[PDB]
């Protein structure tokens, strides 16, 4: 019942890394006017889940685009503008992404320390 | 030959642990090679087949990467630590069994 | 680990856009000149999962 600790900690590490990647992507594309197809960029974020086969590690279910309405600015001399001359811009909270990165990094560090301690105890168990 | 088989179970377990460790080290070393595919083996089924010439499987990617590199870091690092711990556990079990067999002849 | 590459690419493209704006500002008196617009395009990569 002590080898599941590695699985739980690895799942936590992977979930935190995915959240950090999503935050970095949002920060990078904070000011993306359009994507490949033409639709305006929309902020994305992960949805965690409990990875219980009873409790266990954390698990990322999927990635969803934020339901908050995208911003829109006035620019008639742009082919992307609609009939009213409004071009859509993504709705990204820069402070939100920053604090998400901070929390993800701290949780990453905590999980690393947990894994290190458990590895040390497992290593010392064999000296019975 | 009875001794051969009785120690052979653990000896083959240790050998497969060593092979898996080598593959994990290889995909750690090549972690930044573009166009690389993460490789791994299924320990339980491989051991069953050997007890009753090693095939390897492609690890399922978790995130996309433009340079074509699919070998993650965190998952394989946890795998490396787990494999090292289980290799040490197998080593000490085999050593205990051998010492128990030996001390009877004293 | 690869999350560093998207951020560095964003920084490099920001530097390029700054270069474009500086080039626009440099020739602020050349007769019959047309300014250069600039914009950032998102280029998602479609892998296997997530």
């Amino acid at each position: 019942a002590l080898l599941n600790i590695f699985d739980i900690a690895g799942s936590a590490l992977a979930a935190q890394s995915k959240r950090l990647n999503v935050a970095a992507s949002n920060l990078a594309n904070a000011d993306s006017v359009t994507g490949p197809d033409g639709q305006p960029y929309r902020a994305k974020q992960v949805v965690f889940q409990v990875d219980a086969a009873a409790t266990g590690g954390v698990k990322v279910a999927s990635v969803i685009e934020s339901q908050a309405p995208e911003k829109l600015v006035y620019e008639p001399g742009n082919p992307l503008a609609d009939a009213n001359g409004y071009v859509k811009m993504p709705n990204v909270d820069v402070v939100g992404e920053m604090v998400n990165t901070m929390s993800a990094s701290r949780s990453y560090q905590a999980n690393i320390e947990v894994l290190n301690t458990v590895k040390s105890m497992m290593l010392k168990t064999l000296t019975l | 030959d009875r001794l051969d088989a009785a120690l052979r179970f653990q000896q083959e377990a240790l050998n497969l642990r060593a092979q898996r460790q080598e593959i994990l080290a290889a995909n750690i070393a090549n972690a930044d090679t573009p166009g690389y595919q993460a490789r791994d083996i299924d320990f339980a089924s491989e051991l069953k087949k050997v007890m009753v010439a090693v095939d390897l499987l492609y690890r399922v990617p978790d995130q996309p990467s433009l340079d074509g590199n699919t070998v993650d870091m965190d998952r394989e690092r946890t795998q490396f630590a787990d494999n090292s711990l289980k290799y040490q556990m197998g080593l000490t079990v085999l050593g205990s069994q051998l010492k128990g067999m030996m001390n009877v002849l004293q | 680990d690869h999350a560093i590459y998207t951020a560095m690419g964003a920084a490099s493209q920001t530097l390029n856009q700054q270069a474009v704006t500086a080039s626009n500002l440099a020739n602020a008196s050349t007769p019959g000149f047309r300014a250069q617009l600039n914009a950032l395009r998102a280029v998602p990569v479609d892998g296997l999962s997530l």
Binding site: - | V60 | R41, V43, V45, D46
Partner: peptide, 21 residues
Amino acid sequence: GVPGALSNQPAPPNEAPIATP
């Protein structure tokens, strides 16, 4: 399947098209 699991055939190539044809 789930990320981090094992599968028989490799992942498809990853591409980043600047503009969809």
